[PDB]
Amino acid sequence: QVQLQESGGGLVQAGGSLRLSCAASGSIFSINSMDWDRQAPGKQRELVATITSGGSTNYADSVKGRFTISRDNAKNTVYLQMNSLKPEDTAVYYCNANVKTWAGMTRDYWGQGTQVTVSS
Amino acid sequence: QVQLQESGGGLVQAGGSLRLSCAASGSIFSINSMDWDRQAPGKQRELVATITSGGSTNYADSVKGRFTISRDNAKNTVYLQMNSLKPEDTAVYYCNANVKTWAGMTRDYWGQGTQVTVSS
Amino acid sequence: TFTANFKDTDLKSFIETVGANLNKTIIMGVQGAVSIRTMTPLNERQYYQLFLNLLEAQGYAVVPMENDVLKVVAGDEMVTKVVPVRNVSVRELAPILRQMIDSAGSGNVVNYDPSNVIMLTGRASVVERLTEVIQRVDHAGNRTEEVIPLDNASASEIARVLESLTQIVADERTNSVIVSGDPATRDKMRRLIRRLD
């Protein structure tokens, strides 16, 4: 089991910034990567950024250099620092934890999401 | 206000058939049109079929001939008879009541939806 | 035209204010607190509707009666806005605006006017997203068209060939092609036609 609780969403103007947080709990030891992805109505859910248990980071082309994913293992949380926000970024952002199971397969747990809205 | 409850969804093989039912309640007198629309994950919600309060009917190109919308005012229910189903029709089907307000504008009320799956 | 700016206003107060403004006598059984900001000016219909929406949100309905009596029975800010629509029917947007409110949670309402403007009541964040979508579709149904005649190649043929990979229609009469897009798109499509010619 792993539970995810996101926060930090809201309305912002083009060029502004927001900081999303996500607090994980349960089997932290099983978490082998954590990612943010987003979804706007009528479109595909798509990967935004990822931080592995090693600390290795991965970023989508549209967000690289503007977004930064980061970690705080004391508080068991990950963060998405979104700078220079564009209307294109408007979406519900979900925090997801890819955990390793006792069987040796992987499984995704993720939260209800947080809405980010960017005006012109 | 108007409240709507869908039913009739389920799994069916290509060429099979289903009948959706939707029971309306509340301000039935305000309803001036009822329609079924559908939404698959990753796509626009689109209009399938419409029946006005005068009993006129509208059908999207993709379903015409295969789908019949109909009405039973004694039970305050509208139906969607879905014949010759294709995989393309796999979606959550929503029943939506368009109503007139005291102010003279219109407002939509719709339901949680009923899932339809069509296997090859 | 009309305007509204209430901040934690007692429901009874709110009702009385709108009543006087609309020249309507109000009756009440009714606790609650109201909050709303009008981003644009509203006409009598739209204002009345705003009143009807806010009551519904709080759990109350209106019952219109004998000689004009009514009986009652940052991104989070509650706002109302009217969006004119210029090139497309407002009801053609209803499906995708219903999709939008389904991802937005409760408290938000889209109303459609027979004069072909949409009125949005809800939280500023949601209302911004609804505005964006409307304006995007409305601007899309305004694509300027161009006729492009062909000296050598066939009109039908070029249309069929291009339409297979992608609006492009032919008119054999004058051996011409009609191309429906925007200055970015049309300029690129023209050169492709010329080159085929």
Add this chain to the structure above:
Amino acid sequence: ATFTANFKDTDLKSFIETVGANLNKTIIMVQGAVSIRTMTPLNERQYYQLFLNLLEAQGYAVVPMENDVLKVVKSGDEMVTKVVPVRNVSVRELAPILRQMIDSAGSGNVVNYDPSNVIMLTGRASVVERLTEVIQRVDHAGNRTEEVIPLDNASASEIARVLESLTQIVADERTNSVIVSGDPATRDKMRRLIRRLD
């Protein structure tokens, strides 16, 4: 070595005992029923994974312990499992859209990913059908046939732009050719259009 599961309102305890004997694990314990039909044969990792999935749904979890021991503790509709091999594409590329799919599905459905590059699906037949449709579609889409078309006159990168601007096509600057990829229908079409700009 492959395993099967066909249970219909089987007492949760009996299920756990059956699976433990099959897996050579001691089981220490819990109330409930269990139904599940294996649509494909499962290997031991997948069988064990099913077991965890059905326990999780009922509100239970496993603790692996000293010497092959598992302690069970508190934590269209037909319940089915299926293992979908994926041939042309990395399974974690599907993850975001499989997650989207499940947020419409409702509860009790689970997608599991195997490092051997197969997805396992556990849940209601309808939800499982949909997830299969999508996996297979993306898989098949990643295996399009490719074809080089040389150009005698035109510049390959121009034709690359012009058609990619109004639409896969890729230029090869070295041999001045275009590499188009699709089905017989879509390549036929593109072959012709390219030929006319020469």
